[PDB]
RNA sequence: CUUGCUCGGUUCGCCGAGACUCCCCUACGUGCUGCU
DNA sequence: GCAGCACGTAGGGGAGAATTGG
DNA sequence: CCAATTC
């Protein structure tokens, strides 16, 4: 059975207003900040909120938050739901923790007075309230507006929303495509591919780009061109795919191309689709995020073909191996070591269902390319280039009583473990700060996927199986084995880790 | 494979290559060594 | 058990849709 | 047509 709904982003067009001033926005935030600040023993008391309109009404009218004009039970049910599952959330987390140490206190206390000894004293065991009644680790606001059944994606239509400058597909009709022909464009014109990079084109099934592409106009050492941004912007908004989401009285209205790439790349919908179809692909209950200008849809369950499975190990893990061999007779191993030169080494095999046991058929050991190897260097000048960087910034701003203290450490004795805090900390903040950070974060994350899909599409190909499985043990290590981890949970295939 | 993101090439006309599980908020922790 | 390094970590909460009632 | 119930 399918259990996993990836995401898939698209941008915001047009607004009627802001998206702050909206009244679910409002009513959201007020509902918030009353639920989190109120102590643990009139939590009960304000627990009664009810799945109704004469629940909802009755809890808004015995608390003051002001309802705002936004009286619709579907996403009144999802703010408050939200709000006291995040209040219970911190206790949870107390609680956890409570219970492990007093599960240790079970285990020791109990063998030492096997053994004879007396148990110890208990523990101070960790309370979520404070010093009076509050949350100590008071939950903050959730800037996100959840849609619903109400309020879902509909194409656009002239009789919609007069206002809107750039015009809407059809719902019905199949969608449009790029330019087909990109070998016929006249010269002089967009999209024009001169006479001499034309033999060395690639024939393989890239993506489209269209020539107003922010990625063929970026600031990059070699690009000796202009980035005007208005007339790239006013060329996109010339091939949009409008949908709108309205909400009451205020309206928003989203370019849909995100989603047709995300059908589109992942091979569940040909070209020649419809926009209800493309709708339909998706919930109907996306995210908006106010801050940048994204709307969040998740794919309907039955949409993709992953089960999202955990990484078995151990005893299960010979289970798991004879029953793929119960399945498709042909099933190839690869294991990874890491650490060893290069980031990754790997070792295919073949294992049967001989009767009970198995039999591995080894296949060979392959090397990451050499491609890969020095785009993995130039991330590394990368980072260690905004690291010397970003650390120097919170050397300097450090308190004089700090800063010198600093400073001697860089000079030519260790001391200061009191200090050490104070730039971990300043460090941590900075980097949360450091946007190049975020962006060299992310890079690690992409290369570390464009690794893990070459290992698992050329164990496809020395063992000619459609069935693979992954071994791992528990710098680019980290990284590495993170995304060798979520195989099972984005992709489905099994990480056999021993 | 029409938007968005990342890395490279250029004759600057755009083209070669990638990722697609993502969001909020809160604490300060996790590994690796050295001695008991 | 308790220091010194380095480097971000851990863990709460999210992410719909059929129906039926005026 | 569009909210409100319900799992």
């Given at each position: 059975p399918a259990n996993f709904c990836p995401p898939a982003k698209v941008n915001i067009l047009a607004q009627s207003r802001p998206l702050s001033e909206w009244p679910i926005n409002l009513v959201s935030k007020g509902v918030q900040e009353y639920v989190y600040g109120l102590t643990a023993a009139e939590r009960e008391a304000n627990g009664?909120?009810?799945?109704?309109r004469k629940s909802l009404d009755r809890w808004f009218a015995r608390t003051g938050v002001p309802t705002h004009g936004y009286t619709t039970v579907q996403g009144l049910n999802l703010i408050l739901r939200h709000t006291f599952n995040r209040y219970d959330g911190v206790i949870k987390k107390v609680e956890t923790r409570n219970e492990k140490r007093r599960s240790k206190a079970t285990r020791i206390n109990v063998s030492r007075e096997a053994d004879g000894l007396p148990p110890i004293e208990a523990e101070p065991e960790e309370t979520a309230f404070g010093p009076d009644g509050k949350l100590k680790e008071r939950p903050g606001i959730n800037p996100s507006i959840y849609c619903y059944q109400q309020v879902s994606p509909v194409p656009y239509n002239p009789?919609?929303?007069?206002?809107?400058?750039f015009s809407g597909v059809d719902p019905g009709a199949p969608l449009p495509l790029g330019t087909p022909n990109r070998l016929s464009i006249p010269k002089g014109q967009p999209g024009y591919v001169p006479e001499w990079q034309r033999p060395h084109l690639?024939?393989?099934?890239k993506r489209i780009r269209k020539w107003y592409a922010r990625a063929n106009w970026r600031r990059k050492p070699g690009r000796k061109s202009v980035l005007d941004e208005a007339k790239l912007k006013e060329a996109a908004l010339k091939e949009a795919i409008p949908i709108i989401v309205t909400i009451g009285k205020d309206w928003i209205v989203m370019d849909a191309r995100g989603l047709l790439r995300a059908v589109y790349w992942r091979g569940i919908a040909k070209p020649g689709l419809s926009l209800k179809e493309l709708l339909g692909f998706f919930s109907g209950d996306p995210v908006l995020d106010p801050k940048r200008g994204i709307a969040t849809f998740t794919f309907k369950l039955?949409?993709?073909?992953?089960?999202?499975?955990k990484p078995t190990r151990g005893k299960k893990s010979k289970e798991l191996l004879l029953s793929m061999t119960a399945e498709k007779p042909h099933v190839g191993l690869v294991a990874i070591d890491l650490?060893?030169?290069?980031?990754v080494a790997a070792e295919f095999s073949r294992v049967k269902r001989e009767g009970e046991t198995l039999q591995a058929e080894p296949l060979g050991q392959i090397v990451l390319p050499d491609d890969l190897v020095k785009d993995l260097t130039r991330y590394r000048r990368a980072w260690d280039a905004t690291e010397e960087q970003i650390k120097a910034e919170a050397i300097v701003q450090l308190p004089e009583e700090c800063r010198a203290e600093v400073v001697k450490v860089n000079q030519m004795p260790r001391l200061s473990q009191e200090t050490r805090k104070a730039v971990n900390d300043k460090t941590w903040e900075l980097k949360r700060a450091s946007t190049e950070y975020v962006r060299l974060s992310r890079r690690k994350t992409e290369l570390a996927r464009r690794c893990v899909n070459y290992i698992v599409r050329e164990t496809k190909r020395w063992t000619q199986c459609e069935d693979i499985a992954i071994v791992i043990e528990d710098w680019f290590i980290q990284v590495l084995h993170k995304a060798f981890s979520d195989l099972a949970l984005h992709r489905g295939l099994p990480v056999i880790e021993a």
């Open positions: 009664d909120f009810g799945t109704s009789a919609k929303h007069p206002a809107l400058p690639s024939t393989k099934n039955g949409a993709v073909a992953v089960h999202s499975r650490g060893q030169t290069n980031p």
